[PDB]
Write a protein that binds this DNA or RNA. Sequence first.
DNA 1: AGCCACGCCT
DNA 2: AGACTCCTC
DNA 3: AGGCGTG
DNA 4: GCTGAGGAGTCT
Length: 613
Amino acid sequence: TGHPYYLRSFLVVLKTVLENEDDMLLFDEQEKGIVTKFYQLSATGQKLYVRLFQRKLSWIKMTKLEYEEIALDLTPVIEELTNAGFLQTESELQELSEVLELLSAPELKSLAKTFHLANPNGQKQQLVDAFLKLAKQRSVIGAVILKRAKALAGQSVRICKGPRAVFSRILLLFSLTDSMEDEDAACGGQGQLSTVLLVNLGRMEFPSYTINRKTHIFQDRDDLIRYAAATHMLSDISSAMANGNWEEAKELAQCAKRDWNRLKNHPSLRCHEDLPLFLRCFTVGWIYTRILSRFVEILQRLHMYEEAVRELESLLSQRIYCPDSRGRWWDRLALNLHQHLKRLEPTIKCITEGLADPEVRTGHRLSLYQRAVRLRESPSCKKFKHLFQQLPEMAVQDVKHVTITGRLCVFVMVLCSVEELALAHYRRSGFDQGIHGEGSTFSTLYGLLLWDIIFMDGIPDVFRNACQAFPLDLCTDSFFTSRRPALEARLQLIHDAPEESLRAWVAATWHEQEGRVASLVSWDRFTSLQQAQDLVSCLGGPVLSGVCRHLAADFRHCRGGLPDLVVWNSQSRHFKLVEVKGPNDRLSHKQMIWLAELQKLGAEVEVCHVVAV
DNA sequence: AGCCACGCCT
DNA sequence: AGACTCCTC
DNA sequence: AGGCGTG
DNA sequence: GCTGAGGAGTCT
Ligand SMILES: [Ba+2]
C-alpha cells in the first residue's frame, strides 16, 4: 500500500525541513499556504505533481503524459492540480516562443507550409527564428500564427512557476545537510536531490544523534533567496563548462563577479563572516567565492593566464571564504607563474607564502615544496640563495615499486580491471585475501571504531535536522578540536588494544548500526563482519590508530590518496598495502604522503605497475 | 577533485 | 547515421 | 624515454 | 574532457 519511491522521498524532504522552526521563518504566509495545499491534494494528485516537478520546466503535450501506476486517464488529476494552482493549462499559453518550442519539427513544417510567406524546409531552430521575426514586424498576422500553433499542438500543461519556486527552496534547504555537501551530485528539473536520495530516502535509516542548533544561517527570507540565486548561477557556470561552452561560461562568471562586488557592505555579510566555517559554507559569499574559483578554471582553459593569476591573487588575499581551498590556489598560482608566465622571481614568493600558510596541507603543501626544490636545484635560478631560507626538508622516504604484465583488450586474465589483475598477482604471492576499497576500506574502519564519537552529543549546530549521515563540522578543523579529549582518549585506547578488543569493538558498532546511512561507512565494503575483524587483526592497534588520527584530524585533506588495495594472509597474518598503477596513472602527491605515513606506522607498502601486453 | 589519454619539452 | 535532449531508476 | 602539464 | 547507466524519442 506504500507510496511510489519518488513520492516518499519528496515527503521525507518536506517533513525534514519544515519541522524546524528556524527554517520556517524563511517562508512567508503565502508560501506556507502552498505547502499546506500540497498536503491537501489526493495521493494521485501528489504522485503526479511530483512527476512533473521532477521533469524539465516547460509546456508538455497532454499526449506525452503516461503514468499507469498513477492513474489510467489523468484528466481528473490534472484538473485537480489546476484547481490548486500547481498546474496551468493551454489557455494561459500566451508567449509565442513557448507555443512554437512546444511543437515538433514535423509540426513546424506543416505550419511552415499553410503559411505562404514561410520556407517549408530546414531545421527546427531555423523555422523558429523565422516565425519569430515574422510576428515581430506584422504583429496582426502573427496573432493568427499563435492561434493555429496552439490549436495544432493540442492540450498542454505546465508546472506553475509560483509553487515550484517554493518546493525548490525547500529542496535546496534539505540539500545542505545530506546532499550538495557530500559531493555535487545529479539533480534534474530546476532544483533537486541526488539519484541515491530520490530513490532511497524513503527506505533509508539514519544514525541516531541529537538535533541541536543555536545559530541562524540565513538572516531572513531574503538571505535565503539571495543564496539560492548564487547557487543557481554556479549551477549554470558549472553546466556550461561541462558542455564545453567556455565562452558562455566566461561571460556568466564575469556577470557573477560583478554582482558579488556590488554585494559587499550589505549588512547581512557581517553575520556570515561571524559564522563558524562549517556553517559559513552555506552563505552567498562562499558560493560567490566558489564561482570565482571556477572562473580561474575558465581563464586557464582560455589560456588567459595573467588574468587567472590576477584572480588567484585576489582570492588568496582574503581569509574569510573557502579557506580549505587555499592549498589548491597557492599550488595553482605557483604553477601558473612558473610554467606559463615564466616569471621566476614571483614563483618563489608564491611558494614561500603558500608554505607559510597553515591552511595548506598534505598534497598541495608537498607539491609546493617539490616545485621549490625543482627551482633551487636549477641553474637559471641559482642567481639567489632564498630557497635556502629554512625549507623544512620534507624528504619523502622511498617505496618499493613492482611491475607485472597483463593482456590488454579493460584487460584480460574474463574482462577485468587493472586492480583485479593485481589482486591475482598478490593471490599468487601468498596473500589469499584482498579488498579493492581505496579510501573506503580505511574510512569504514574509521567509522566503525569511532561511530559514537562521530555522532556524539554536545557540539552546538552540528546536527540541524533528521537526515544527516555525518555531523556538519566533520570536514573542518573544528571537528577534531571540538571533540579533542574524546578522540585523544579513543585513539590511545585503539593503539593499545589487543586484537580481541579490536574485533569486539568492530562487532559492537556493526551489530547495532548495520544498515544506518553514514557517510564514512560502506556496509558492503567488507563481505561480512568476520572479514572486518580479520583485517583489524592483521593491521593491529598502532596502524589503525595512526590512520584514524589523520582521518579525524583533517579528513578534508586526508580523505584522498590511500592505496587501492589491502592484501593479507589468513594464517600468517601478513598484510600489504598496494597502490595499483595502470599504464596511464602515476603517483599523486597525496598518494606519496600517504605511503610514507603508512610506512612510518610500519606497514608493507608497495606500488604495483601494470604493463599492457 | 580524481580519472585518463594524449602531447609538449628535454 | 549520428548528435542531441529528455526521462527513469 | 621520463617529467610535467592540458583538455 | 570525463564524472550514471540505460533507453526512447527527436534533431540535423
Ligand atoms: Ba590507483
